[PDB]
C-alpha cells in the first residue's frame, strides 16, 4: 500500500466514510486491539478489518462504509453488537492512519 495516493483516500474518508462509520456506531464505543504506525501499514490493517467478514457479522463487507472503502482503495491503491465492535476497531485504525506519516 506504499504506492497508494493517501491524499485522495483521506478526502474520501474525511468527507464520506468517517460520517458513515460514526453514523453506524451511534455513540457506541469499545477498545481497540492492534494499532499501526504508518499509512501503508494502517491501510493494510484497515482493508483487512473492513472487507473480510467475521463470525457474527458476515454482512460487514457489504455495509456502505465498507463498499466505499473498497472503492477508494481500488481507485487509489495499486449479531449487531459484533458489527458495532468491528466498526469501532476500523474507525480507530483510521485515526492512526490520519496521525501517521
Amino acid at each position: 500500500f506504499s504506492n497508494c495516493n493517501f491524499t485522495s483516500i483521506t478526502k474520501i474518508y474525511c468527507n464520506i466514510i468517517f460520517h458513515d462509520l460514526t453514523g453506524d456506531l451511534k455513540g457506541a464505543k469499545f477498545e481497540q486491539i492492534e494499532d499501526c504506525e504508518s499509512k501503508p501499514a494502517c491501510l493494510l490493517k484497515i482493508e483487512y478489518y473492513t472487507l473480510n467478514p467475521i463470525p457474527g457479522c458476515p454482512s460487514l463487507p457489504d455495509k456502505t462504509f465498507a463498499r466505499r472503502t473498497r472503492e477508494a482503495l481500488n481507485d487509489h491503491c495499486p449479531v449487531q453488537n459484533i458489527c458495532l465492535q468491528q466498526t469501532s476497531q476500523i474507525l480507530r485504525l483510521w485515526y492512526s492512519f490520519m496521525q501517521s506519516p
Binding site: 478526502k11 468527507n15 460520517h19 463498499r67 472503492e71 477508494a72 481507485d75
Partner: protein, 193 residues
C-alpha cells in the same frame, strides 16, 4: 444539440440523495440512465416529471465518475462522464429576515443554513444580494461564511424599499458544484435620516 445538464443534492429528505437532470424541445420516448459509482446496482433509470428527470436514491457511492446517457431503447444519443460529488447543488438558505437597529443605525440580516444540520456537506459559502426594489440598480453582494451580517444605514438610501435575497454554494475540498437557487426575496424599508 441534445446537450443536457445535471446536478446532485445530498441528504434531501433524509439520508437519501437527489440527482436531477434536464435538457438544455420534446422528450419523445427519451430516457436518462446513470451507470457506475452506485452501491448495489449497475445502473439506474431516472424518473420523468414534466421537463426534468430525477432520481432519489441511497445508492450513490459519491466516489468515482458515472456515465449519464440519454437513451432510446438501447441507442446512446449522448453520454457524459461526471462525478456526483462534483455536481453538488447547495440548498438555498431560508428564513431570510431583516431588522432595523436604531441604536446601531444598521440593518441586521439573518437566515438559516440547512447544511449545518447535514452530514456530508456541512460548509457552504453564502452570497447575500440586495438593492432598491424599484428602478434599475446593480445588486450589492456580500460574501460570508456565517449567517448574520449587517448593512449600515448610511450605505442605503432613506425612505426606500429594498429587495434582498441569499444563495449558497459548496465549500469543501471534496464536494464541489453549483450555486443554490435564490432564497425567496424579502423586502424592508429604510426610515428617514
Amino acid at each position: 444539440d441534445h446537450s443536457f445538464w445535471c446536478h446532485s443534492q445530498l441528504e434531501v429528505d433524509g439520508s437519501q440523495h437527489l440527482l436531477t437532470c434536464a435538457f438544455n424541445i420534446n422528450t419523445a420516448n427519451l430516457e436518462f440512465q446513470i451507470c457506475g459509482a452506485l452501491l448495489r446496482v449497475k445502473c439506474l433509470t431516472l424518473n420523468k416529471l414534466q421537463d426534468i428527470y430525477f432520481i432519489k436514491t441511497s445508492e450513490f457511492l459519491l466516489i468515482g465518475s458515472s456515465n449519464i446517457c440519454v437513451k432510446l431503447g438501447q441507442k446512446n444519443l449522448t453520454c457524459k462522464n461526471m462525478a456526483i460529488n462534483t455536481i453538488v447543488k447547495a440548498e438555498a438558505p431560508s428564513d431570510l429576515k431583516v431588522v432595523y437597529r436604531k441604536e446601531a443605525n444598521d440593518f441586521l440580516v439573518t437566515f438559516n443554513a440547512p447544511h449545518l444540520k447535514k452530514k456530508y456537506l456541512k460548509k457552504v459559502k453564502h452570497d447575500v444580494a440586495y438593492r432598491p426594489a424599484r428602478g434599475e440598480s446593480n445588486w450589492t453582494h456580500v460574501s460570508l461564511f456565517h449567517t448574520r451580517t449587517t448593512i449600515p444605514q448610511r450605505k442605503l438610501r432613506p425612505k426606500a424599499m429594498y429587495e434582498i435575497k441569499v444563495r449558497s454554494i459548496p465549500h469543501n475540498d471534496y464536494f464541489k458544484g453549483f450555486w443554490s437557487e435564490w432564497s425567496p426575496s424579502s423586502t424592508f424599508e429604510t426610515p428617514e435620516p
